[PDB]
Every structure is written in C-alpha cells, then in structure tokens.
Amino acid sequence: GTEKTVKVIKDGPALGLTISDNGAGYAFIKKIREDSIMSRVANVAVGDHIAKINGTDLNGCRHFEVARMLKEIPIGSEFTMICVEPKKSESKV
Incomplete structure (x- = not known):
C-alpha cells in the first residue's frame, strides 16, 4: 500500500480519530x-493503517496500544505518523 508521512x-487533547483493529x-x-x-x-x-508514530514500529499492535501512544503526545507538540493506505479500486481516465 501507499505509505504516507x-x-x-x-x-x-483530541485528534479526532476512531482507531480499531481486527486482531x-x-x-x-x-x-x-x-x-x-x-x-x-x-x-x-x-481506512489508513497506522504503521509508525514518532519512529516506533506499530506492526502487530492493537488499537488500544496505538491509542495510548497518541494520547501520550503532549498537547502543543508536533508528531509524525507513517500511514499506509489499503489497495482499493480506482479508475484512470
């Protein structure tokens, strides 16, 4: 999938995300x-998968683990997240 930084x-205090996982x-x-x-x-x-936050590899991690990492970021701070898009249908025109 397409990786995005x-x-x-x-x-x-809130980013506006609802995060989940399928196990x-x-x-x-x-x-x-x-x-x-x-x-x-x-x-x-x-639909984007959260692959990394601030350089931490989140492969295998559950939504509650990723959620704590996002909550732990101090208000006022800049953070980086690597997101990966699933491959879904598209049309070239």
Whole structure:
C-alpha cells in the first residue's frame, strides 16, 4: 500500500480519530471526526493503517496500544505518523 508521512501539531487533547483493529496486523483509522485536527490533515484518510508514530514500529499492535501512544503526545507538540493506505479500486481516465 501507499505509505504516507503525516506531520501534525497536536494543539488540543483530541485528534479526532476512531482507531480499531481486527486482531492482527496494524491498527487502522475507522473514523475521522469532521472539524478535527485529523480532518484538516491533507494526507490521512479513513481506512489508513497506522504503521509508525514518532519512529516506533506499530506492526502487530492493537488499537488500544496505538491509542495510548497518541494520547501520550503532549498537547502543543508536533508528531509524525507513517500511514499506509489499503489497495482499493480506482479508475484512470
């Protein structure tokens, strides 16, 4: 899948993400709240797998583990996240 590097100012206590997992692989973004930090991030989308946060490899991690890592980022701090898109259908025109 397409890997994307996301760089975000966490300027409040909530990013606007609902994260889940299916019991294996990477945790993924199930929802992005409108009018949120993450909705304003150009290169992140619902369905994206969260592969890394600040250089930590999140392969195999459950949504609650990824969630704690995002909660632990201090308000006012910039963080980086590597997201991977699943391969879904598209049309070239």
